[PDB]
């Protein structure tokens, strides 16, 4: 409880709200879901000046992502979609369209903002641990146990980011991850120690 509040305070120094009109209540809801991430990761994002940019329009309408216009994202071959159509981006930066959090809103992630921020934590905070020998060994065994095996089962950074989202979204998804991917669950549990 008190830690959730602390995590919301840290996020207040990371989240950037869009200019102009936007769904203020849903933006708060996205922040609240992000506040379930372990404070150690949130503090490290804050320390690295990582901004979580919430958007009211397309990602590629932003100046820093205009270069992605027409580009088909990794693993999105055959969808007929380009970055212009994608509601979230993670890695060295984070940009998220408000209202598109849930599975089915232009994506099939368990949660948009947790998947994207997980990739920023992987890349910025954990120095691409998803591509380390230890996680590759876990990915080889359990990478195909969360579905979407042509995406999660092929890119270890994507399996990491989606598993991280399962771990932190809520108690239900946390339980599902432990049952499907026990080694991954233990790996994430030790990472937060």
């Amino acid at each position: 409880s008190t830690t959730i509040q602390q995590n919301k305070d840290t996020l207040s120094q990371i989240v950037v709200f869009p200019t102009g009109n936007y769904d203020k209540n849903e933006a708060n809801a996205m922040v609240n879901r992000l506040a379930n991430i372990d404070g150690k990761y949130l503090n490290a994002l804050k320390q690295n000046n990582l901004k979580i940019k919430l958007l009211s329009g397309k990602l590629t309408d932003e100046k820093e992502y205009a270069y992605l216009k027409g580009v088909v994202p990794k693993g999105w071959e055959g969808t007929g979609k380009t970055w212009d159509d994608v509601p979230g981006l993670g890695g060295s930066t984070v940009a998220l369209r408000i209202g598109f959090s849930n599975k089915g809103k232009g994506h099939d992630a368990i949660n948009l903002e947790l998947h994207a921020t997980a990739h920023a934590i992987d890349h910025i905070v954990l120095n691409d641990i998803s591509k380390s020998a230890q996680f590759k060994q876990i990915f080889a065994k359990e990478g195909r146990s969360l579905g979407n095996v042509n995406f999660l089962g092929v890119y270890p950074e994507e399996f990491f980011a989606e598993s991280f989202a399962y771990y932190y979204l809520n108690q239900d998804t946390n339980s599902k991850l432990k049952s499907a991917c026990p080694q991954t669950y233990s790996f994430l549990q030790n990472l937060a120690k």
């Binding site: 992605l68 994202p73 990794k74 509601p87 890695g91 099939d108 890349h123 950074e157 994507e158």
Partner: peptide
């Protein structure tokens, strides 16, 4: 580095 959500 940029990565998308699950398709």
């Amino acid at each position: 580095e940029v990565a998308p959500p699950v398709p």
